Symmetry: D2
């Protein structure tokens, strides 16, 4: 009754790199028209555009609408952004599906977008500062990366999950090296070409087409990996080697009923059989995908062994190992083309990002059942099982 006709995503850019000066809605616009032409559906035929996005400060009114309008979606349609942190990009898609499961809409474009590069610094200033220094706050760190309850970085909560799971620095780096190698191989073997839609970075002094993930490091090695020093805990295990990076990107999916796609002669990349969102202790948020995926499975009624393919977002090596280690699913079907550690973590769009990677892989290998999950700041997690046709 509710399928995903098509999907697509920009490449993931590196912090202050290829998209260092590109507003999120511009990446979003690209993804909106991309899915449109991939589904063979017109813009005027879109109901609503649902775009998760964690860091909008200063981009102007409702970037979801900015995105929709640039993309070519008519004013007659509606649009909005939503925030479940790095669970936004995927939640948005479950949100999109309900709209149609309720009869409120027929066709929805949903995903997420983020320009971590463009996130400004800010200060509350209306009162005036009679005297003394004041703080210009990094909205990226403050609003995206810092736990509002304990005051420390997500990274720290990985330190807590790690310590909790007795996960060694070596096993973490061990996971980190794999992700880079998997992601590297896939990229050079064009396993990303399908899902990536090139983005044209406009420039007075020449234009540049970006159609590849510039954050994947070629020839990652265990040896060079262990040379790095702790990033968060001065005597901790987490490093800029086994932690996800800061990135820019966008991704999305076209949503219509299964009877709707049929008329259009469209062959959907999957059907949503369920999803779930669950809460855990913020100190150890990285564990959230456990209850998340374990509810999704219970709803779809699937068994952890029945899953063919899974994409479990790689915020931190520590939390990934722990997630997999507990759910006990086949390691060789997890992040087949690499994970966020390598591809990047554009928070807002990560949920739609890994979604694409998931779907376009289920197709090229003939996978039927899958699952895409993510952990969330504040102690949450989002799930969704996909059932190819």
């Amino acid at each position: 009754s509710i399928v995903i006709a098509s999907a697509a995503r920009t490449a993931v850019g590196s912090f202050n790199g290829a998209f260092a000066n590109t507003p999120a809605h511009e990446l979003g616009a690209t993804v909106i028209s991309a899915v449109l032409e991939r589904a063979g559906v017109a813009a005027g035929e879109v109901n609503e555009v649902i775009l998760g996005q964690v860091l909008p400060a200063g981009e102007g009114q409702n970037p979801a609408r900015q995105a929709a309008m640039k993309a070519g979606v008519p004013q007659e349609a509606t649009a909005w952004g939503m925030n479940q942190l790095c669970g936004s990009g995927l939640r948005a898609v479950a949100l999109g599906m309900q709209q149609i499961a309720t009869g409120d809409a027929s066709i929805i474009v949903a995903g997420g977008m983020e320009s971590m590069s463009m996130a400004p610094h800010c200060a509350h200033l209306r009162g005036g500062v009679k005297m003394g220094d004041f703080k210009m706050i990094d909205t990226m760190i403050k609003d995206g990366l810092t736990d509002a309850f304990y005051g420390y970085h997500m990274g720290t909560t990985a330190e807590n999950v790690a310590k909790q799971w007795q996960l060694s620095r070596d096993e973490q780096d061990a996971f980190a090296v794999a992700s880079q190698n998997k992601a590297e191989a896939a990229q050079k073997d064009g396993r990303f070409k399908d899902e990536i839609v090139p983005f044209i970075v406009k420039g007075r002094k020449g234009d540049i087409t970006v159609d590849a993930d510039e954050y994947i490091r070629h020839g990652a090695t265990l040896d060079s990996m262990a040379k790095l020093r702790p990033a968060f805990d001065k005597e901790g295990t987490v490093t800029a080697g086994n932690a996800s990076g800061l990135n820019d990107g966008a991704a999305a999916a076209l949503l219509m009923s299964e009877a709707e796609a049929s008329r259009r002669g469209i062959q959907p990349l999957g059907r949503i059989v369920s999803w779930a969102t669950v809460g855990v202790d913020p100190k150890v948020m990285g564990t959230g995908p456990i209850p998340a995926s374990r509810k999704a499975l219970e709803r779809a009624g699937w068994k952890i062994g029945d899953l063919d393919l899974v994409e479990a977002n790689e915020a931190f090596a520590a939390q990934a190992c722990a997630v997999n280690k507990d759910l006990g699913w086949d390691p060789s079907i997890v992040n087949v083309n690499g994970g966020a550690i390598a591809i990047g973590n554009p928070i807002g769009a990560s949920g739609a990002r890994i979604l694409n990677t998931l779907l376009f892989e289920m197709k090229r290998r003939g996978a039927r059942k899958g699952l895409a999950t993510l952990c969330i700041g504040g102690g949450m997690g989002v799930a969704m099982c996909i059932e190819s046709l």
Copy 2:
């Protein structure tokens, strides 16, 4: 089948006034706690918390989650923020309603929360400013009050509507006084008492309890209303006097299934019979609730004259006068207790604000079928039909 067990709202604060230094989430929490108590539900029974919010920069990760946590809702539950501008507060309810209607949740706390006082200035400084002056941007205006396509204020889109609907300065001034006087009377007669849950402005040097909409000016003389000068157009028709204002606040409703409240023995404030959101020409965004209301009525099978009461958000005196004249609903049953012009307009919370006013004035005079509606920047409208039982 989907009802609003209870609903509460803080008094609307004035700009830099009552809640000048109070974080939106602190405001939200009050509301969340209140709804639970007013219904009789316990915070631990809460599935998810949904809070619209347009201006959260620098408030830290997912202030929605922050609201639920401070309010008592355990780490088990989920929470998120969403953004549909001034329709955020009402949209959120339609969202929460959907979580249940899709059999995804059991109990939802939905509403909006806003601190336009605590909105900061920002700049993107990552790349650095090589040479020359730059602007620190007021997020409240940039992200909340300015059109992203034309670059002018919502006050100018109202100018557009006033000229295209030919509404004179006198006419608009008339509606402004009318809404003010109604606000002045409805308040003194304690008609706002039920909906308002007092907020405790914690102070190191003197604690303060606020439970009265302070933005309402007493004795609104039509004379001084025609003395002010245009605030947007150097010779326009819109002024501070006939335009809505900057305000703080949080407002919300508890949502469960009609069958759910049945067991709890709760006397419902009403059942949601439909809702809708439609886009209109950006330049004239004010005309949003016009097709948004016909849509919701169309869905509900109700005729405009069948309405027993109406809350049309007063963004401006022009858009207001325009919405009524076209929809042709009895002007006597619209904003019986006043409107945004006099009460205040907490962008993200406004949708719930008026929603609350709707449900309590319905119970007081004994209405069965009403409707709340708001216009949304970028050119959209949101509407929802409420049936008491």
Copy 3:
């Protein structure tokens, strides 16, 4: 040799008080015009204007020249600013004297000006801030009041002196109340009228003439002084009450040779007989007036007992007391009309402010020998000896 033909100062404004929005060069222009008028000297005759000023950030190119031009000093004259911290306004007078002594000028206007209220906050943003909070620095605090070697406020140097000289909280408070009561008495008797030139603060809703020192506290009590909390150390003895304030103002002197004043028939306020500047340990900068005053006295050929009047700037009660204790001059001849604790301390203008007060009191009482001296952040003192003609 070189005489002071005339002098003038503005009243001293309180922090963000009377001159809250008045650029320093506007205050300076009024004092330049006053010295000229008082001496019967035309602006066209001025060779150079030299104005000490510690915090000119944002005021534009060379405020000394802006003030001179505003006063009608011809484009063919020159002007410059300089900075020896609180010593600036007196050092400028010494530098002006030297222009005449070496034959490079005939007529100099010299003193200082300062708008502590108008000093901005700042940040170096050229290299960009890739990630993480950064401070907006209060230039008043950072460039005016913080020791660059130890990183603590001048107030902390005040505590160092109090500890070293064993100066009790009670002794410091008595000194402070005494300063206030002397300043209040002098103000009431009219003793600041001769020195002050009124300043017209321009305004759309009326101009305001300022001609009284607004910082002086009328009816200051020892009880309220004693109840103040320490402002720089939890276990300290320096407070808001016994420290000087943050203030705006300007002050100057018109100089020329003694022979020149005779040809003009001017009766000068005094002959510059000697000056000196010497360094001390930054940790006890408040002791600077000791070696500087001794050196100046040595250069003049005077004993301490030879002095008839002294202005020793009151940066803090603690240092003012150390200085008086070490020099041993009769306290009854020092700051006889009160000092900076009562009158204010606009940094760059202070040394010329106290020179004004000294000069006009010498004239009033017929004192023959005077000395002005100030302490200087980073460990210096400056002193000047003046003899009546």
Copy 4:
């Protein structure tokens, strides 16, 4: 009477180049240490340090004292900063001479230092902006390079001069290419080695020694110069190419009486025979060197033709050409090793920069009589005459 015992300057760094993150006082301390070492004079013998500096915002209290203390000049000596714009570094040397002439000091280190790269952006925020964007002001542009009376850049004053003296774009471009080619030749030949002291930029990942002027363009062509667009007036003649640059550096001279140098057995770089400063119209400030140089020559009792070598600072080709035209000195003796168009223009330092270049070239070629002169924003010139011992 007063001689320059020794001198030194840092290489001049490009805007945001080698010294992008080096506070001016660090450059200053290296040049102070250098003049001491070059003269055989110990830091403990220094009486005062005087350093021109136009842009010290955010550097902390009195950077002049910071430089001196860092170079080991004792706490008992004194130090101060001054500002006569581009004239500062040369004026400080005349001021330092005057300390010795009046018998108030024996040993002075004087010059200037400037970090245009480190100059911050600022805003006055004590009052408090209620609502809306505000400007962060580039202190370098506002306080260093904008005329205070006319509101336009020094570059516009150059256009004013180009029109009044009828200087074609082609003439200004030829001048600029010649400055570069002369500077490139001198650099390659080693003629800046003597004057330059190397500066060590401290880096966590490696110290870098800077001993070459990095702004000098190697192989500058007329074709590329001719292709540049006017930088200040769309129909003007002044460009990035024929204007001086924005730069960082410091430079100084060690001063003492001729009798003192003899006792020490020092062979001085020169005797200071005269100096002068004079004002002109701000609109044509680049002409200041004309009356200043003429006044200095009169004071020296020298004819223009008596000069053997000239350094006339190249603020802009237009003004440098006008200066040369009006004075009529042989252009073959002016800026023989290139000027500021090629070498850079670290404003507060520039006057002592060109003094250094002058002294070492006089020494090498055996020139008896030299003159250094600079133009000054706001309408001023400064010049100094030097004779070999």
